[PDB]
Amino acid sequence: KDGYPVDSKGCKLSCVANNYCDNQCKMKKASGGHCYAMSCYCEGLPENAKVSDSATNICG
């Protein structure tokens, strides 16, 4: 799955840059990530870590 992980951060993270997401994604959350519309779109999660891809339905 791919999208924005939300749980511990609560409401998203306002990534400024792709690297700023990716470094945070790949370390734990996902296999990678990039910064989409100022939200860390993390890429390749385990299924337990639900994500959104629904254009900031979470209160980012």
CA separation for the pair 24, 59 (Å, rounded)? 19
Q: Residue 37 is encoded by which pair of tokens? A: 């519309």
| Sheet containing 32-36, strands listed edge to edge, beginning at the edge strand earlier in sequence | 32-36, 39-43, 2-5, 51-52
Q: Do 44 and 56 contact (CB within 8 A), yes or no?
A: no
Main-chain dihedrals φ then ψ at residue 12, nearest 5 degrees:
70, 180
Instruction: Give the chain's domains with CATH numbers.
Output: 1-60 (3.30.30.10)
Q: Residue 6 is encoded by which pair of tokens? A: 């939300």
Structure determination technique employed: NMR
